[PDB]
Amino acid sequence: REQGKNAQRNNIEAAKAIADAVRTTLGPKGMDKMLVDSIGDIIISNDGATILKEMDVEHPTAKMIVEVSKAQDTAVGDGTTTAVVLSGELLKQAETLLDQGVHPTVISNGYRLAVNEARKIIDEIAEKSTDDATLRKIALTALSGKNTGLSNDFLADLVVKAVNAVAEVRDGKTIVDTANIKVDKKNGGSVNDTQFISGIVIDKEKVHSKMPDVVKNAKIALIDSALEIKKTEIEAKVQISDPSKIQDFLNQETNTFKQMVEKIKKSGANVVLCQKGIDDVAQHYLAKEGIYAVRRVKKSDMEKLAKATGAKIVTDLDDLTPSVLGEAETVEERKIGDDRMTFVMGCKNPKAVSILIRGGTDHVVSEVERALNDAIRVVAITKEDGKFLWGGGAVEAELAMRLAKYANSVGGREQLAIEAFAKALEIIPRTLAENAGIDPINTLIKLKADDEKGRISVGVDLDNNGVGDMKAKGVVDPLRVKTHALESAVEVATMILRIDDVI
Amino acid sequence: REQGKNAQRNNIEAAKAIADAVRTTLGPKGMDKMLVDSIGDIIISNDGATILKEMDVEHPTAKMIVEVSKAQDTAVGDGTTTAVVLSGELLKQAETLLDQGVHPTVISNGYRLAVNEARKIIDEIAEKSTDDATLRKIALTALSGKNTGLSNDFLADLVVKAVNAVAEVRDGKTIVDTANIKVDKKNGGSVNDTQFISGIVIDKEKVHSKMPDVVKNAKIALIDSALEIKKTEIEAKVQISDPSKIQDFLNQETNTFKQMVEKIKKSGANVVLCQKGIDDVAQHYLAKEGIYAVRRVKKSDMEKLAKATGAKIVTDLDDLTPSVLGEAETVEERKIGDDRMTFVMGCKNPKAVSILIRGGTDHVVSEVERALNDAIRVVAITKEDGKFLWGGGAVEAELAMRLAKYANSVGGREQLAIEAFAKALEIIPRTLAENAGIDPINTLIKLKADDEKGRISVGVDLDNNGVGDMKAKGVVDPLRVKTHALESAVEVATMILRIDDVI
Amino acid sequence: KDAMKENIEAAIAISNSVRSSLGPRGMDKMLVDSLGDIVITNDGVTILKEMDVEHPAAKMMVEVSKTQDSFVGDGTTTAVIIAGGLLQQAQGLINQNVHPTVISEGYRMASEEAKRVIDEISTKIGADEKALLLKMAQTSLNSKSASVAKDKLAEISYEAVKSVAELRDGKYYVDFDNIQVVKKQGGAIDDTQLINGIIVDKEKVHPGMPDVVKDAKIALLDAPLEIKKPEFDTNLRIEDPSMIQKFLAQEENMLREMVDKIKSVGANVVITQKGIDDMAQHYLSRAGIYAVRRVKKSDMDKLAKATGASIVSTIDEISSSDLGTAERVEQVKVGEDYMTFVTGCKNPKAVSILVRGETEHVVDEMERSITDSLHVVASALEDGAYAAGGGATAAEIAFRLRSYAQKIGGRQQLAIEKFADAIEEIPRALAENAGLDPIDILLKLRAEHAKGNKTYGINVFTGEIEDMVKNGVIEPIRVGKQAIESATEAAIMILRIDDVIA
Ligand SMILES: Nc1ncnc2c1ncn2[C@@H]1O[C@H](COP(=O)(O)OP(=O)(O)O)[C@@H](O)[C@H]1O
Ligand SMILES: Nc1ncnc2c1ncn2[C@@H]1O[C@H](COP(=O)(O)OP(=O)(O)O)[C@@H](O)[C@H]1O
Ligand SMILES: Nc1ncnc2c1ncn2[C@@H]1O[C@H](COP(=O)(O)OP(=O)(O)O)[C@@H](O)[C@H]1O
Ligand SMILES: [Mg+2]
């Protein structure tokens, strides 16, 4: 148990630490971490949430900072590093106000004021635009400090395209259900070989060799149950008194599978995607019937497939009518890499696409996937929000400048508190610079002035080796991410600030 | 071994800690510490240097901060707490500039600029005055957070008086050799019974009962040697072949002591102060001669006595001529407390006085002595310097205000560095307040403005419960102490700042 | 193979421990021995002589430090940095099956050429002796924490050496036994001052001796003032009670006569290396003689040279010709303590520097930092030439070695070029330490030097590659030649050792 000062400074020290663990992954010139467990083993990533979910955090307070990365990730997709680094800085900056005598609460109130205020300035200075031109920009930037190769422009384009292909419009606004974009990956070396499939890809093979290698104009039946011999819920026993029956019983079994197949054929279905298993005799006849079957299909998939082809997931083959079959121009098995996979294309419903990721190693494909997800999520958000911000320290520098001014128009103690939040915001520019290997302080000094002269969009230009116009370079931060990062950070910073005794 | 960041932050952490150990002893509403060893035992004090010399510091860096208290003390007497607390704050404030990217060196250069600058502002705003009226003021303030009772005004007066009684003038300037002021103490309960003796007091009794209880118009002989039977450097042996001689040899001894006494009487000396021992037979005859003798007199004293009475310290009694005897109207033994002490008054040389400290317990007398010393030292300095400053956070508040302005008129990085030194200076006001139990932040806020409106002398008024006019309350900080505190602090802060690797 | 790999690494390790202290953005080290003794400094020789190195290779690298320190005085951090370079580079060459003999020859040849270059690109100190030497003194102070007062300390360093410097064959010579440097805490750095004379940190042996003697006849002894007991087993036999006093008087007389001798020869001050008996003390005192005792031998010599005295170890034969001379000797309180100042020495080419620092560990570095300047302005003065600092001359030697490499071609050439890259260590360190981008500065550095800008170095403050002699960063030529000398001799030694056993 720790009381007062001990507890607090200690808590701020904990948060600060966990926060630095990811600090170097920020921005373009970011680095990666290598986490190794006991069995699975090596995991190499640049993703904030990953490096932390996998990290073995022990200190309670540190566990709380980790919580924000997992939230940032699942709630907004991008920004996990930022929210962590920011929480570390708000807690750190507060430690000064604390030593001077300012009460944790008023500090918590300053951060409220400040964040609520910033939550307006950004929305004030946010830049609207929904054209593919910028959607592409959001993408390029979301893929920066990541090990994706030189293909980023290619990847950005895949993402913009996938988002646009699934973006629907309802009562006036555009919605993008990221769930309609199925991303997968396969070791085969390339990264450029990343295919954009206008359909649903299933990492599965057809169950039986003789089944059609491809099926055009397919009537797709999704099945909940396993095409196998079922047993009655009430224990049963078979008493054979006549030798003859021993065969008859063995036949019932066969005729059972024959009928299952018959029900299936009768519906018109020529493609059977089974969430569960398929018996070898069932397979014999499905093949004899010429139906393309796939067993043990992932429920996640069973669902996407249902949505993409318009089919109804049926359990009781007795309710397998033509009415519940899905549609796809082609259902074809094709060998992607060492693996054979089932391609379902021309789905009744077009708002369902895939991104089959390729790349080599393994360790490179997983991450490229992680990078492509951040990109997919933010491009999607931006598609909906139609607003964005000036990246690379720009937004922050501005917010900091304005907030330090708003500070003066506030009380004594709270001012001190909001000036603290203003500085905390400068942590991003400083970080991007530090990692790039440039001079934090001067970068900041220069960045302040340019933004002060009204140059909203001057960010940290690693290329120009200092400050520069993010407008030109096209570095844009999506709105929703900034805000959740800021709000998440303030809520968690406050939580920790009030803890005066940990037991 | 620790390299870079580790080493540095760690070093600043060490200094900070040792610095807080004494922080609560600052000012009037100060507290005391109780250090306990293994044998001597309990030591209770408010003195900065004491609490630290006795403290068991282990960390190297902490040992360095301790060095400044010992220096502040032996070099300037007052200010040991301040110099420590200040070094802690300059190292602490620097830790921010460090994290932002500022280089230890430029920080070291800012502190130079800043301190060199402050070293002028104070000398600019210093207030001249040498009248007893203010000398008394310096005293009262030097005795504040200390456990001296309610007698402070009485004590202040003793100090002013002692300083004035020994202050000499040479080529135009006043000199005060604090060595001419002999302070002593004796358990007897009182603190008011603290006598101011216009002479030299010696914690010693006359060696023999029959010796005069008092000696008027005394001719004082100071003796380096012991009035005892001496042996030749080259080993000697006495061979008695005749029984008769056994007595003759025993007589030589007696006649030896008789002559020693004779030499002494012949000189005119009637008082013998012996740095070494005195034989019982020597005592017999000194008493028979009626000479007041004292043995094993402390060399420190032998020296003050020589200076006060004008006597020459003689070793060879053959060079004990009337020419080398000192003078004192009276040499009298008097029982101070449980102890009998030898009072030498009316010394040939008036610029030599004593302060016989009384007070009870023991633990109270030692400290009261420590308090009276700070007072003696600063009153002395002030007597010479004739300049002083506005106490209780005043000087600091002003310096901080001016230095933050000078900061702007300086470069980029160095400005940051000097603004840091400006804040570090506010540590004193904040501290005085904190201890008093008042609100640091508001006190500071209020103190800034009043000093800003030109109210140099507004310090932290514990009575007014906040800020107030130190001019009125008469709280004055001696110049020399401020400056050595500032200079000492900067030199040591810089030393530690450059250490990037401790091994 | 391995013994070598291990040796090279151990060595390079020591190098790095010192790298961060090079230059104006140099950092300092804190060293705490077993006894808990702390030494916080920047002086690489000290950092090295101090640290606890065990690996034999590491000890060998440290051997470098002391030697560079020994001969020149400034540049021990430089020597070490290069020795690491050379070793780290040989590490590469060694991977390509280049024989350590080839590497050693190549290194030797490059080294030779490197010193030639320094002589070539050097510059005779002209009539600007004053400001040139001042600029040198300062650059030295720039790396140390004494920078704070580099302007005053440099003037003092310049003043002090100029004073004891004898210009013989139109050439100068500086005997440091004419520059007494003392350190006393309790004063700011700016308080450091130059005292014409020899200050001794010793006060008078007895309360009764005078605080000042004018026109002093200094008697310097290297023997104690005490009764001399024979060498043979001697014993006094007293059979008559009267003899006892006769003997005791005789013993006092012997001491009273020693004092008489010293006095009779006209001695006014008696400074002894040994002890002064208490009774003898009375006598000197009574005679009005100012006497100090148990004085430091090193100090004894300095007082000798200064006052033109002779260190008598046979009091019985102390002649008047043995007396030193000084205008005045006086006890002065230097802060807390009482010091004895022998001012107005017979020999005016003797002076003292009183280093002031508020704290022990502070004044200690201050004292080290100044000694570095003295050694510099002195070494410069003597040499007569200087080279542009800030990595300019290094970049220069680096430049010229790449050419010579192409001339003395072969495998030798690979070693000669690596030697060049290694010398480039200085600019890299200097840049790194400040914050400058090493690879960028190094590239720009090479450019200018290629274009014959033999004095373009790294202005660690602006981050620009400017004219080093112009901006005033210059150093005695002697510093550079030894560093490269000591550095290559370490590299070659470590480079021939293919096995290390007990
Ligand atoms: N090309 C770029 N130029 C400048 N800044 C960039 C660039 N790309 C990304 N950034 C900035 O890096 C920060 C985000 O870094 P990132 O590694 O993606 O972490 P996070 O998990 O917080 O998204 C943002 O401020 C972003 O604008
Ligand atoms: N009566 C007072 N009112 C306000 N401030 C005071 C008073 N007395 C002392 N102080 C302040 O307390 C500080 C010194 O506290 P003190 O315990 O004496 O420590 P130090 O060892 O540094 O002298 C100074 O700023 C001094 O002016
Ligand atoms: N003002 C300066 N600007 C750039 N470089 C400097 C400056 N002053 C000194 N240097 C360089 O820094 C190095 C000296 O650093 P220092 O720590 O004293 O090392 P060393 O122990 O070898 O003398 C030299 O190469 C010198 O020329
Ligand atoms: Mg991102």
Ligand SMILES: [Mg+2]
């Ligand atoms: Mg005090």
Ligand SMILES: [Mg+2]
């Ligand atoms: Mg140097």
